[PDB]
Amino acid sequence: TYRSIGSTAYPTIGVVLLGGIANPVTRTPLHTSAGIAYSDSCGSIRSETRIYADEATHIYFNGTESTSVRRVLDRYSSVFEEAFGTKTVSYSSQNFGILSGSSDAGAASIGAAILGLKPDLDPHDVENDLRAVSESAGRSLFGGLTITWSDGFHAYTEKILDPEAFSGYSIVAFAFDYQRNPSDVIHQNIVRSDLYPARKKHADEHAHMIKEYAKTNDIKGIFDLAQEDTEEYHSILRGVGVNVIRENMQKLISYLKLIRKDYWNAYIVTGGSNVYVAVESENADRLFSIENTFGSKKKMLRIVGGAWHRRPE
Ligand SMILES: Nc1ncnc2c1ncn2[C@@H]1O[C@H](COP(=O)(O)OP(=O)(O)O)[C@@H](O)[C@H]1O
Ligand SMILES: C[C@@](CCO)(CC(=O)O)OP(=O)(O)O
């Protein structure tokens, strides 16, 4: 028997932005969404996880002990008993350079560690258990561009494009320093909007459009749609009191409308205080070098693959 296993996953960015979860425990998405897994050129932006045999159950985030994760570990106690010789395992996670979408990565890394222990497991089944840790875990488990179909009862994640399809594109992230609204605050309020039912329908409509664009690798059509979805999403949120796009972020966006005339770009805003800007590779350095970032820090990002594990120790 072994003593521990390591694994790694990459953070995610919504493309069809998810708002609302069926239940605070199982965290099933109330509607269909889509996303991409991202990192930087070196793959340095990531979440690393270690699951190991222990006398008692410990959960560690960035070296800090934590009093959701235990639920997943317990459900797969049989896997660990076989691999380690005990059901009692501890979890240790370390995040690096992640902007938004950290929880997705942490959850996916758990899944890839489990699949690494019992490879014949159905990853789509494991994904269901992982949503308790983060509702968008599928994005990071499968990588690339995914669509997660959902009616609020059952959710299923599908790979639509590999990261290689995005070889000609880059994402420049502008990180602002504004305090962010917890994701749970967003899920809680968006359902209160009168426009929510319509939003659930349009979200599904957009996902289908993304799948068609995928047929001919219309990468630009997909990011353009993501900008439109971003605008709808955050209009609904503002209407319920959740304002993600703050002053300097609005300013950056207005700047982007001008630059778009010069060379193509499209932006996405999730729940955090970041503006993600899609752009062609030949223009990435150019965008990355602009001066008036309105106090924001800049990161160069790429689309990457799904969670993976290492040989058991
Ligand atoms: N590596 C990890 N493993 C498990 N849970 C994590 C990990 N990183 C963060 N989390 C949990 O997810 C929460 C943040 O999730 P969320 O609000 O979705 O932020 P983000 O959008 O950046 O993921 C944190 O408060 C933490 O409790
Ligand atoms: C709010 C959102 C996910 C919340 O579960 C929207 C989305 O990306 O689909 O973004 P973020 O919290 O990961 O930043």
Q: Is the distance from the beta carbon of residue 106 to the nearest atom of ligand 2 less than 6 Å?
A: no
Give the Å distances, CA to CA, from 291 to 187, 255, 288: 35, 11, 9
d(CA 14, CA 46): 17
d(CA 212, CA 306): 22
The two structure tokens encoding residue 27: 């965290």
Distance between Cα 183 and ligand 2 center (Å): 6
100 labeled part of a ligand binding site? yes
Among protein residues, the one whose CA lies closest to atom 8 of ligand 2: 14
Distance between Cα 136 and ligand 1 center (Å): 11
Distance between Cα 42 and ligand 2 center (Å): 24
Query: In testing the pocket of ligand 1, which one of 103, 104, 186 has its CB within 8 Å of the most ligand atoms?
Result: 103
Structural resolution in Å: 2.3
The two structure tokens encoding residue 307: 């969670």
Nearest listed ligand to the Cα of residue 272: 2
d(CA 187, CA 24): 10
Phi-psi region of 2 (alpha: psi -120 to 50; beta: other; left: phi over 0): beta
Among protein residues, the one whose CA lies closest to atom 4 of ligand 2: 183
Residue among 101, 45, 44, 267 at smallest CA distance from 172: 267
CA angle 129-132-134, nearest 5°?
110
- For the CA atoms of 189, 191, 196, 202, the dihedral, rounded to the nearest 10 degrees, stands at 100
Exposure class string for 41-68: b at 16+ Cβ within 10 A, else e: eeeebbbbbbbbbbeeeebebeeeeeee
Atom number in ligand 2 closest to CA 183:
12
Domain boundaries, the chain: 1-10+40-143+305-313, 11-39+144-304
Among protein residues, the one whose CA lies closest to atom 14 of ligand 2: 271
Distance between Cα 19 and ligand 2 center (Å): 8
CA angle 232-236-242, nearest 5°?
125
- For the CA atoms of 100, 102, 107, 110, the dihedral, rounded to the nearest 10 degrees, stands at 140
Task: Return the DSSP state at 231.
Answer: H
Distance between Cα 101 and ligand 2 center (Å): 7
Residue among 7, 11, 274 at smallest CA distance from 136: 11
93 labeled part of a ligand binding site? yes
CB atoms within 10 A of CB 182: 10
The two structure tokens encoding residue 195: 């426009």
d(CA 101, CA 98): 7
Strand 46-53 with 4-9, pairing: antiparallel
Among protein residues, the one whose CA lies closest to atom 1 of ligand 1: 106
